[PDB]
């Protein structure tokens, strides 16, 4: 239930979506960044790592934009109010809508989303894992023989690194034990 | 074997990965449940009870050979595992009991393998009096030790590193006249050393345990740790082995044939029932229904099966479309995720969903009353001795093992191959042996 | 070519090809001249200059990739190298009608070597 | 007792007197009932089973008939139920199907050869002779008093061939000491200057002894198949002494000699190496012992010990 990664082609003009590292079917499977999807055109988007890099940041830097600006929405499935001026009264679940005075209020982009999505990015740029988890010997050996240079790997490494550091920067993966057992 | 063996203390205020957190949680809980099962199966000293555990335990990253101070991997894992699950069971006596009891027996086992020198020296590192005799005193005091206590036979006492004690903690080894005395520095075989260690451990451990339970509210202001806030013992397994879309493809007709040899009692009896009735209530099917995805037949094929079993029992051939079949189909749609989009696990057909009059969904071994169930199971052509030893565990209110022993008998194979947790896993096995 | 026949102990009368196929490697890299290493000269004599005890830097001479390998490989290297701009530079870059320019610039060629490849594939 | 248990109970009437003993002469009485009872002896030693005086699992088939009937390997111990057997396949690695349990009571005629050949095709090492099969069996260690008899084992490992036309033919893996169920010099440092001069210790065969410290492999040839071993004593004494071994009845010792161990041997010839002034001793046929800068392209390596696992 997150939002996929859409991508603009630098030459053919078409668009793309990058869901899982491998692009589909089994023994055929190929790396995502290899060939533009549009059948005919033959440009290979990998060779534009840096450009991808840009959009990556220039995309994430709106998701965060939402959260710290987080909407507030109503719960009693009739009222359906949308505002931000957090009111001050409180109860078990939290605060209370001013109009439907018999109901709670909920965040819209629940942080769980934000962290989920950042995991979703860091997923599809870290092929190394999904490569290791693969079962069949011969498939692994043949594909690696085929097209896993240090170069391609390194480029994945680069963008994946950007993502991972940018979330682990500081929000959520930590749980400060020094306040949890006092 | 590792340094690991240690008396829990001093919460390690690091700061860590949320992923690793829930990982350790699940791992440790698995270890606990397992140890309990493995134990209640056999008796302690049997070498199955050793082999199996020393396999599993080593498999889940907790016991290897020598390494650095404390940031060696498996000891750290053990450490943070416990000092998390501490937050698990702070809300019952029965719970805190079960947790203590299990950790107790684990430590017993996991400790019973250390080399003797490592044993005594680490006891030394533990507290003060944990010190050993000189074996010369074995010769010097064989008469005293042997004739004193009945806890030793003849003269053949092995080369155990016997121990010097303060009587002040011998509080049962001596009053029962079970040891020689040298000014309260009685000398006792290792057995009672383990005993006393374990008893002081239980004491101190409970004494700590109660404290956190008296200091809960902190977590209440977070919800990342919402599962382990109070959500472990519930309707998720170890994990989803027999999940959506695993190995299987079989045509309709064969089902009944396979039934007589492959359907775990709950299912089997429900399928007999719907073979007779050809009608079921609002909730009932929603077990059997998803259970069929266990083998994973196609909807229109499953729809056809149910249609046969519906209109032959006179269910209006028009209702079917806008009624049952509708939801039966949706059972593979958008919402149902972890609610319907999954099969069921015994810990969902036990811990909840009360079965009502004359209905069939629900664990027989729980809901079926004892002796009615006795004749009932017996009707599966079962030796009454097996039935009896089964009903024993059944009133021991631990049932998975009962299902287990039943299968073990009905196929006569003298290993359960696993520790069952899901009826569909049971099924995949039953088909494996063919 | 059946494996065992290609892998029999080579000799005129049963000669494999790997017997010779590596010929340029076989010869340009390591010509002969040092007599046999014997138990007198490995286990008994000291000092011994036995080859195994000697560890030596050794660069890379070659490799025999797949036909298809080279095909797609070149395809990719070239296609990627496809700089549109540097094809025709300033100023005539801005000195053509929208017909004639796309006309004259719809075609390109190139060629490449094994020398640009480490190792020198063959 | 129908044919089921008669399968075992016939060993007292058909099996042992025909396949586990040389039928060239009388069927020994020291062997048939002795093994008949020894099987249950070592069984009831521990005997984890339900209780069945017939160990139904094992039998006896001549050693070169597995390649005719069990075209697959066989490695077992005693008393493992199918479950406990299924509880041994992890200790280091489970990669690939574990060795099969075609259960038999491995009994073979021990000989320093296998076939009817004695000089050229000599193997030296100890292998199995039977009444319908004559095979090789991979040893571990050798002492010197088990030549020309029959030995039995409940612990054993076997292997069927690859192509009976090719090199990869069948063999066995021997785990434990030779168990027959039958009713059964010049120290290196103390002689450090004897052939150290040629003028003193050449010509005739003299006895020697010492602790094997530096032993290489054993090479074949067209004519001169041999090996050269080196020995001594403890580590703060850097000097060794060397012997050679070039006899079909003496490859047994490279199959028997072991580092860190010591020996006392007799009947060891001299060496007279052609064009090489390197006289040291050898053994011979009539001997029997008992147990006691761009120049840094090319660089010269170093030496260290280890002990690992096939990976
Ligand atoms: S194991 Fe659980 S689900 Fe399976 S038959 Fe027994 S009670 Fe029913
Ligand atoms: Zn494109
Ligand atoms: Zn409102």
From Swiss-Prot, chain A:
Protein name: DNA polymerase alpha catalytic subunit
Comment on protein domains: The CysA-type zinc finger is required for PCNA-binding.
Binding-site positions, Zn(2+) 2: 74, 79, 97, 100
Disulfide bonds: none
Lineage summary: Eukaryota, Metazoa, Chordata, Craniata, Vertebrata
Binding site for Zn(2+) 1: 9, 12, 36, 41
Subunit structure: Component of the alpha DNA polymerase complex (also known as the alpha DNA polymerase-primase complex) consisting of four subunits: the catalytic subunit POLA1, the regulatory subunit POLA2, and the primase complex subunits PRIM1 and PRIM2 respectively. Interacts with PARP1; this interaction functions as part of the control of replication fork progression. Interacts with MCM10 and WDHD1; these interactions recruit the polymerase alpha complex to the pre-replicative complex bound to DNA. (Microbial infection) Interacts with SV40 Large T antigen; this interaction allows viral DNA replication.
Stretch list, region DNA-binding: 1-102
Organism, scientific name: Homo sapiens (Human)
Subcellular location: Nucleus; Cytoplasm, Cytosol
Physiological role: Catalytic subunit of the DNA polymerase alpha complex (also known as the alpha DNA polymerase-primase complex) which plays an essential role in the initiation of DNA synthesis. During the S phase of the cell cycle, the DNA polymerase alpha complex (composed of a catalytic subunit POLA1, a regulatory subunit POLA2 and two primase subunits PRIM1 and PRIM2) is recruited to DNA at the replicative forks via direct interactions with MCM10 and WDHD1. The primase subunit of the polymerase alpha complex initiates DNA synthesis by oligomerising short RNA primers on both leading and lagging strands.
Chain ranges for the short sequence motif CysB motif as given in the UniProt record: 74-100
Additional facts recorded: In eukaryotes there are five DNA polymerases: alpha, beta, gamma, delta, and epsilon which are responsible for different reactions of DNA synthesis.
Zinc finger (CysA-type): 9-44
Similarity-based family: Belongs to the DNA polymerase type-B family.
Parent sequence residues shown: 1275 to 1456 of 1462
From Swiss-Prot, chain B:
Any GO molecular function: DNA binding
GO cellular component entries: alpha DNA polymerase:primase complex; nucleoplasm
Pfam families according to UniProt: DNA_primase_lrg
Resulting phenotype, residue 76 to A: Decreases primase affinity for POLA1 by 10-fold
Result, substituting residue 86 to A: Decreases primase affinity for POLA1 by 30-fold
InterPro entries: DNA_primase_lsu_euk, DNA_primase_lsu_euk/arc
Location of region: Interdomain linker: 232-249
Interacts with PRIM1: annotated span: 245-434
Gene3D superfamilies given in the database record: 1.20.930.80
Reported cofactor(s): [4Fe-4S] cluster
Gene Ontology terms describing biological process: DNA replication initiation; DNA replication, synthesis of primer
Domain of life: Eukaryota
Disulfides per UniProt: none
Keyword Iron-sulfur part of the UniProt annotation: yes
Keyword Iron belongs to the record: yes
Region RNA:DNA duplex-binding, residue ranges: 279-421
Cofactor note: Binds 1 [4Fe-4S] cluster.
Protein keywords: 4Fe-4S, DNA replication, DNA-binding, Iron, Iron-sulfur, Metal-binding, Phosphoprotein, Primosome
Residues involved in [4Fe-4S] cluster binding: 266, 346, 363, 403
Entry domain remark: The RNA:DNA duplex-binding domain interacts with the template phosphates at positions -2, -1, 1, and 2 positioning its bases -1, 1, and 2 for duplex formation. Interacts only with the beta- and gamma-phosphates of triphosphate moiety of initiating NTP of the primer. The side chain of His-282 mimics a RNA base that would be paired with the template nucleotide at position -1 via a hydrogen bond, thereby facilitating the stacking of the initiating NTP.
Job description of the protein: Regulatory subunit of the DNA primase complex and component of the DNA polymerase alpha complex (also known as the alpha DNA polymerase-primase complex) which play an essential role in the initiation of DNA synthesis. During the S phase of the cell cycle, the DNA polymerase alpha complex (composed of a catalytic subunit POLA1, an accessory subunit POLA2 and two primase subunits, the catalytic subunit PRIM1 and the regulatory subunit PRIM2) is recruited to DNA at the replicative forks via direct interactions with MCM10 and WDHD1.
Family according to the record: Belongs to the eukaryotic-type primase large subunit family.
Protein name: DNA primase large subunit
Source organism: Homo sapiens (Human)
Curated annotation (Swiss-Prot), chain D:
Coiled coil stretches, renumbered: none
Places the protein is found: Nucleus; Chromosome, Telomere
Known role: Component of the CST complex proposed to act as a specialized replication factor promoting DNA replication under conditions of replication stress or natural replication barriers such as the telomere duplex. The CST complex binds single-stranded DNA with high affinity in a sequence-independent manner, while isolated subunits bind DNA with low affinity by themselves. Initially the CST complex has been proposed to protect telomeres from DNA degradation. However, the CST complex has been shown to be involved in several aspects of telomere replication.
Subunit structure: Component of the CST complex, composed of TEN1/C17orf106, CTC1/C17orf68 and STN1; in the complex interacts directly with STN1. Interacts with ACD and POT1.
Family designation: Belongs to the CTC1 family.
Disease (UniProt): Cerebroretinal microangiopathy with calcifications and cysts 1: An autosomal recessive pleiomorphic disorder characterized primarily by intracranial calcifications, leukodystrophy, and brain cysts, resulting in spasticity, ataxia, dystonia, seizures, and cognitive decline. Patients also have retinal telangiectasia and exudates (Coats disease) as well as extraneurologic manifestations, including osteopenia with poor bone healing and a high risk of gastrointestinal bleeding and portal hypertension caused by vasculature ectasias in the stomach, small intestine, and liver.
Record-given protein name: CST complex subunit CTC1
Gene: CTC1
Residues of the full protein shown: 8 to 363 of 1217
């Amino acid at each position: 239930d997150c939002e996929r990664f859409k991508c603009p082609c630098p030459t053919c003009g078409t668009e793309n979506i990058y869901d899982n590292v491998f692009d589909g079917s089994g023994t055929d499977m190929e790396p995502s960044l290899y060939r533009c999807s549009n059948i005919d055109c033959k440009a290979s988007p990998l060779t534009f790592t840096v450009q991808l890099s840009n959009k990556l940041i220039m995309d994430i830097r709106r998701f965060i934009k939402k959260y710290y600006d987080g909407w507030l929405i109503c719960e009693e499935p009739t009222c359906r109010n949308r505002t931000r001026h957090l009111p001050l009264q409180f109860s078990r679940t939290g605060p209370l809508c001013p109009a439907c005075m018999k109901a709670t209020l909920q965040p819209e982009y629940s942080d769980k989303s934000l962290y989920t999505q950042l995991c979703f990015y860091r997923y599809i740029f870290d092929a190394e894992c999904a490569l290791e988890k693969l079962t069949t010997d011969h498939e692994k050996d043949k594909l690696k023989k085929q097209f896993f240079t240090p170069k391609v790997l390194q480029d994945y490494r680069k963008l994946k690194n950007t993502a991972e550091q940018f979330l682990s920067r500081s929000g959520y993966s930590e749980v400060n034990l020094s306040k949890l057992f006092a | 074997y590792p340094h690991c063996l240690q008396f829990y203390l001093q919460p390690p205020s690091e700061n860590i990965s949320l992923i690793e957190f829930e990982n350790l949680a699940i791992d440790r809980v698995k270890l606990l449940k397992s140890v309990e099962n493995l134990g209640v199966s056999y008796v302690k000293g049997t070498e199955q009870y050793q082999s199996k555990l020393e396999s599993e335990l080593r498999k889940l990253k907790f016991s290897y050979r020598e390494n650095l101070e404390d940031e060696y991997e498996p000891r750290r894992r053990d450490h943070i595992s416990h000092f998390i699950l501490r937050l698990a069971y702070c809300q019952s006596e029965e719970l805190r009991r079960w947790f203590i009891q299990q950790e107790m027996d684990l430590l017993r086992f996991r400790f019973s393998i250390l080399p003797k020198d490592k044993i005594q020296d680490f006891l030394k590192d533990s507290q003060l009096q944990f010190e050993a005799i000189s074996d010369e005193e074995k010769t010097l005091r064989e008469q005293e030790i042997v004739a004193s206590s009945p806890s030793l036979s003849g003269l053949k006492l092995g080369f155990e590193s016997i121990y010097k004690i303060p009587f002040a903690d011998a509080l049962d080894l001596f009053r029962g006249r079970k040891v020689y005395l040298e000014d309260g520095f009685a000398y006792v075989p290792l057995k009672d050393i383990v005993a006393i260690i374990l008893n002081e451990f239980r004491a101190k451990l409970s004494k700590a345990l109660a404290l956190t339970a008296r200091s809960l509210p902190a977590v209440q202001s977070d919800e990342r740790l919402q599962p382990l806030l109070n959500h472990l013992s519930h309707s998720y397994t170890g994990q989803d082995y027999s999940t959506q879309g695993n190995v299987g493809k079989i045509s309709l007709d064969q089902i009944d044939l396979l039934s007589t040899k492959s359907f775990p009692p709950c299912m089997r009896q429900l399928h007999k029932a719907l073979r007779e009735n050809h009608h079921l209530r609002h909730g009932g099917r929603m077990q059997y229904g998803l259970f069929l995805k266990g083998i994973g037949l196609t909807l229109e094929q499953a729809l056809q099966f149910w249609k046969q079993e519906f209109i032959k029992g006179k269910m209006d051939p028009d209702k079917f479309d806008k009624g049952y079949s509708y939801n039966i189909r949706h059972s593979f749609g958008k919402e149902g995720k972890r609610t319907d989009y999954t099969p069921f696990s015994c810990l969902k057909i036990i811990l909840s969903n009360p079965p009502s009059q004359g209905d069939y969904h629900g664990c027989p071994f729980r809901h079926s009353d004892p002796e009615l169930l006795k004749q009932k199971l017996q009707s599966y052509k079962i030796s009454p001795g097996g039935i009896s030893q089964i009903l024993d565990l059944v009133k021991g209110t631990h049932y998975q093992v009962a299902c287990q022993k039943y299968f073990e008998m009905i196929h006569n194979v003298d290993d359960c191959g696993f520790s069952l947790n899901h009826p569909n896993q049971f099924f995949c096995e039953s088909q494996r042996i063919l | 070519l059946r494996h065992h026949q290609f892998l029999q102990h080579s000799s005129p009368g049963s000669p494999s090809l790997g017997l010779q196929l590596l010929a340029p490697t076989l010869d340009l890299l390591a010509p002969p001249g040092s007599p046999v290493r014997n138990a007198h000269n490995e286990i008994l004599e000291e000092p011994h200059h036995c080859p195994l005890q000697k560890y030596t830097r050794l660069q890379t001479p070659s490799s025999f990739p797949t036909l298809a390998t080279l095909k797609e490989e070149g395809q990719r290297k070239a296609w990627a190298s496809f700089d549109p701009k540097a094809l025709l530079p300033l100023p005539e870059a801005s000195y053509l009608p929208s017909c004639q320019l796309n006309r004259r610039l719809a075609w390109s060629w190139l060629c490449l070597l094994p020398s640009a490849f480490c190792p020198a594939q063959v | 007792v129908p044919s089921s248990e008669q399968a075992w109970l016939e060993d007292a009437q058909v099996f042992i007197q025909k396949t586990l003993c040389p039928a060239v002469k009388e069927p020994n009485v020291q062997l048939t009932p002795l093994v008949i009872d020894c099987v249950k002896t070592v069984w009831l030693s521990q005997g984890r089973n339900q209780g069945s005086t017939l160990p139904l699992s094992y039998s006896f088939v001549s050693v070169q008939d597995l390649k005719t009937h069990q075209r697959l390997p066989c490695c077992s111990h005693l008393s493992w139920s199918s479950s406990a057997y299924q509880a041994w396949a992890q200790e280091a690695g489970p990669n690939g199907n574990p060795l099969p349990r075609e259960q038999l009571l491995l009994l073979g005629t021990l000989t320093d050869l296998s076939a009817d050949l004695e000089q050229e095709c000599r193997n030296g090492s100890l292998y199995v002779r039977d009444n319908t099969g004559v095979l090789s069996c991979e040893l571990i260690d050798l002492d010197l008093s088990w030549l020309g008899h029959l030995f039995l084992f409940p612990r054993w490992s076997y292997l069927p061939p690859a192509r009976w036309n090719s090199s990869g033919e069948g063999h066995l893996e021997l785990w434990d000491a030779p168990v027959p169920v039958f009713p059964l010099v010049l120290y290196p440092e103390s002689a450090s200057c004897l052939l150290r001069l040629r003028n003193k210790l050449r010509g005739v065969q003299r006895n020697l002894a010492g602790s094997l410290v530096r032993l290489s492999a054993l090479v074949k040839s067209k004519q001169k198949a041999y090996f050269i071993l080196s020995l001594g004593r403890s580590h703060p004494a850097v000097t060794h002494v060397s012997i050679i071994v070039q006899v079909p009845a003496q490859l047994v010792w490279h199959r028997a000699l072991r580092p860190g161990t010591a020996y006392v041997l007799t009947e060891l010839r001299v060496s007279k190496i052609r064009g090489q002034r390197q006289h040291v001793w050898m053994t011979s046929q009539s001997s029997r012992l008992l147990l006691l800068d761009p120049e840094s392209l090319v660089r010269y390596s170093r030496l260290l010990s280890y002990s690992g696992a096939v990976t």
